[PDB]
Amino acid sequence: AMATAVALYNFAGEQPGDLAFKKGDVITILKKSDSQNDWWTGRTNGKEGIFPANYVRVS
């Protein structure tokens, strides 16, 4: 099934297409790369968008 990750920090998701979340939220990964320097794509509590990979820890 899809990868999931725990948010290590808040992210305000302030630009278009971003996913906002809070520390401790469980993010469903829609698509990721193999790198911590990239922008990954996720979903949490009914919204979706992009966020910095290093803000989460894949479970």
- Domain with residue 49: its CATH number is 2.30.30.40
Provide the residue range defining the domain that includes 11: 1-59
* Three-class SS state of 44: strand
- Sequence-ordered list of residues with C-beta below 8 angstroms from that of 44, at least 6 positions apart, any chain: 19, 21, 25, 26, 27, 28
Share of the chain residues as helix, strand and coil, in percent rounded to the nearest 5: 5, 45, 45
Question: Are 3 and 44 contacting, i.e. CB atoms less than 8 angstroms apart?
Answer: no
Total domains, the chain:
1
Q: How was this structure determined?
A: X-ray
